[PDB]
Design a protein around this ligand. Structure first.
Ligand SMILES: Cc1cn([C@H]2C[C@H](O)[C@@H](COP(=O)(O)OP(=O)(O)[C@@](F)(Cl)P(=O)(O)O)O2)c(=O)[nH]c1=O
Ligand SMILES: [Mg+2]
Ligand code: NA
Ligand code: NA
Ligand code: NA
Length: 326
DNA sequence: CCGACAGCGCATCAGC
DNA sequence: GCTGATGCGC
DNA sequence: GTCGG
């Protein structure tokens, strides 16, 4: 974090535009600028120097000049004093409350943690569980706990059916020393792009993890994506571990490499890589890479035998997961 | 100048 | 109930 | 908010 003050400023601007202004493109522009500045290997000395990077334009360069000269940004100092903006920003920190619900609650006089606590009947199920674990979901997960969680998930999945493969993705797979949640990619030979020979493939795993009291709550659940809450077991007289977010994604087994590329991220890396694919005339999702015809219509899926094959198609040198943390 | 900005699963609601 | 739009979060 | 054409 040679440039942590600047990237913090840009992230706070991004959050303002997303949560308060509901200007999703300004939000993505600011996160793109923070990302490229975060990886720039020199302490930025001027907005001019920063404007040389792709994604920093005239407006952000001027903000950086103000921040360098004074250590702050008047625009943000004013946002911080504004009650409505501060209230809306805070409410979106609850899982399942986004910009729209945050403004609806604030318009109703529901502005603080206790207001939510006293109006639990105005929350949907996701939001209710988000509020329940508000503190826990602020806490990062040390990699050592991620390794215990992996061992549980892998062993419990193996007990349901030895032909499942579970892969922990997200920031853990990129080598991070701490993660915000646990992302699990799941495959089974019964579920391919050709057929689903077995029902309840995801449910079976979730059920086993609930049985052993690892999964404690559900945020949403369908046939291929589970989002919920889990907890490591603690020892006698030991304080309990925080509850943790867990996402499980069941992907057709023959589409594993597109799925593991997607679920490894980062999100910004995925955005960069998918944008580059579009420029090269391909489209990449978590299932396939397909060519784009002269009309923009996605073609037929291309053969994929490794993560590197996806990079080769779009003429990118291969990047290890540890180098995808944008 | 200005069109595009990655891609999608699940929850919820509205219109029928 | 279906279908399509919107919210939210990977 | 930024950028390619
Ligand atoms: C949020 C998001 C995620 N993804 C992919 C890429 C992420 O790496 C993967 C997991 O989503 P997370 O939000 O858990 O991201 P993460 O990289 O694991 C993380 F670093 Cl933000 P954390 O460790 O906090 O979960 O889903 C996207 O493609 N687009 C997205 O908008
Ligand atoms: Mg994650
Ligand atoms: Na630039
Ligand atoms: Na939220
Ligand atoms: Na996640």
């Amino acid at each position: 974090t040679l440039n942590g003050g600047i990237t913090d400023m840009l992230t706070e601007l991004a959050n303002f535009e997303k949560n308060v202004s509901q200007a999703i493109h300004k939000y993505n522009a600011y996160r793109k600028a923070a990302s490229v500045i975060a990886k720039y290997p020199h302490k930025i000395k001027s907005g001019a120097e920063a404007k040389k990077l792709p994604g920093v334009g005239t407006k952000i360069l001027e903000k950086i000049d103000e921040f360098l000269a004074t250590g702050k940004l008047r625009k943000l100092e004013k946002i911080r004093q504004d009650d409505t903006s501060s209230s809306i920003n805070f409410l979106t920190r609850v899982s399942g409350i986004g910009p729209s619900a945050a403004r609806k609650f604030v318009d109703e006089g529901i502005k603080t943690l206790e207001d939510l606590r006293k109006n639990e009947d105005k929350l949907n199920h996701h939001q209710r569980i988000g509020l329940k674990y508000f503190g826990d979901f602020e806490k990062r997960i040390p990699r050592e706990e991620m390794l215990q969680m992996q061992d549980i998930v892998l062993n419990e999945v193996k007990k349901v059916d030895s032909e499942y493969i579970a892969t922990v993705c997200g920031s853990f797979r990129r080598g991070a020393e701490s993660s915000g949640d646990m992302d699990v990619l799941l495959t089974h030979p019964s579920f391919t792009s050709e057929s689903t020979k077995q029902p309840k493939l995801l449910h079976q795993v979730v059920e086993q993890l609930q049985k052993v009291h690892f999964i404690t709550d559900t945020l949403s659940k369908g046939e291929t994506k589970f989002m919920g809450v889990c907890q490591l077991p603690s020892k006698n007289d030991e304080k309990e571990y925080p509850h943790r977010r867990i996402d499980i994604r069941l992907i057709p087994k023959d589409q594993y490499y597109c799925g593991v590329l997607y679920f490894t991220g980062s999100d910004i890396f995925n955005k960069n890589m998918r944008a580059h694919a579009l420029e090269k005339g391909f489209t990449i999702n978590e299932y396939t890479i397909r060519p784009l015809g002269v009309t923009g219509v996605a073609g037929e899926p291309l053969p994929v035998d490794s993560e590197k094959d996806i990079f080769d198609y779009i003429q990118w040198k291969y990047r290890e997961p540890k180098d995808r943390s944008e």
